[PDB]
Design a protein around this ligand. Structure first.
Ligand code: NA
Ligand code: NA
Ligand SMILES: [Zn+2]
Ligand SMILES: [Zn+2]
Ligand SMILES: [Zn+2]
Ligand SMILES: [Zn+2]
Lengths: 230, 228
């Protein structure tokens, strides 16, 4: 599977230009919790999709991109406003990395005093990494009201983020910012929009293929039934 | 209105916004003036539409540098026509970053024209070092991919070529127009920007929100004069 690049960070290469990382960080009362993200590389320029929970781990990751990939991190896109998405944005901004996100994520970050991504979109936005398309789509609420997905057309790889659960997952998880009623519909749109997905990376846990989508949908619907009757 | 050169003049609309008019010849029609915008924040500038060519674009960009002491770092074209992206080649050679309707990008690619970098489909708010540049695609009009750029902190709308100045009587170049969709787009624009202080068209004098209704009338009148 992966390769360690820190005592807490491991990385898995999915394609010549795409890698997915696993960042482990302690969360009070849950021990070391892993969160996923992506590193996309084109012409020695890199895009980081989600940051680890803090600056320190984000800096480790970016230093690896420089030291081992000989790439400069120029681009950043977060899945949503949670920590496993923008926990390291303060460091990236100190470093001059440009950012793009769902306009909803920007409003939420501003409202909450968190580091704020620069450019906001409402429907879709294809960020060009020196000619390589990183297609960002907001298809509706799910795990978080502002959650988006990032599709890499040239690679057939989808970083669906936290709205998607890994195959070993059995619970809906943290729903404090979720839109459980919209969530199954959002998954339906994801399924239909990216039928050629070869790799599908969730916000936490092992990546897989398109089955993660149906897997997640069953979890949300089971959650809905469980908390509705009797 | 200040003269930048014999073929380019610029008018300041607010502390942070300027509108330029550059004159270039259209094969078979003579000299035609086209409009664009210069928005400035913390010595960084956004150019909305470029003159018809690299030469004129470079002239304008050096003036922003020397007279306005701002560096152009950002670019947004109204659509794929020359009066929007004619000087994109030069801008890209200068390291200027660009955002545009995805439609504009696809059109520029299929035509072998300079291609903007980042494409959006509904709306996009570009941050000029904190100053918002709100871009919206509200439907086809003068061109199928035409958008508008709203400056919320200024109440200034660069509507582009989908809008005509007050003196206009004709619909103008409609070779890439979506005439039947156009009035519907103007309705969407009207409902969306009732607070406009300045409304700048792709060609002609800028005015107020009245250019939107005026244009709707021109497009409708056109539809009539060709249906008798
Ligand atoms: Na993440
Ligand atoms: Na123009
Ligand atoms: Zn989350
Ligand atoms: Zn998460
Ligand atoms: Zn045009
Ligand atoms: Zn025009």
């Amino acid at each position: 599977k992966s390769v360690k690049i820190s005592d807490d960070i491991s990385i898995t290469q999915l394609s010549d230009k795409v890698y997915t990382y696993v960042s482990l960080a302690e969360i009070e009362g849950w021990g070391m919790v892993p969160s996923n993200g992506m590193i996309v590389i084109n012409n020695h320029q890199a895009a980081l999709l989600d940051t680890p929970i803090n600056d320190a781990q984000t800096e480790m990751l970016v230093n690896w991109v420089t030291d081992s990939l000989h790439a400069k991190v120029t681009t950043f896109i977060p899945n949503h406003w949670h920590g496993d998405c923008i926990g390291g944005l303060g460091y990236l901004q100190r470093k001059g990395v440009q950012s793009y996100a769902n306009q909803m994520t920007i409003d939420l970050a501003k409202e909450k005093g968190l580091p704020v991504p620069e450019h906001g979109f409402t429907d879709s936005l294809t960020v060009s990494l020196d000619g390589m398309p990183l297609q960002c789509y907001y298809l509706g609420g799910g795990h978080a009201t502002d959650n988006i997905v990032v599709w890499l057309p040239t690679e057939n790889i989808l970083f669906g983020g936290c709205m998607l659960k890994d195959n070993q997952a059995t619970s809906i998880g943290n729903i404090s910012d979720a839109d459980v009623t919209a969530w199954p519909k959002t998954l339906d749109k994801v399924k239909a929009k990216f039928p050629s997905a070869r790799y599908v990376v969730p916000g936490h846990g092992d990546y897989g293929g398109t089955e993660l989508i149906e897997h997640t949908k069953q979890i949300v619907n089971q959650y809905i039934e469980s908390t509705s009757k009797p």
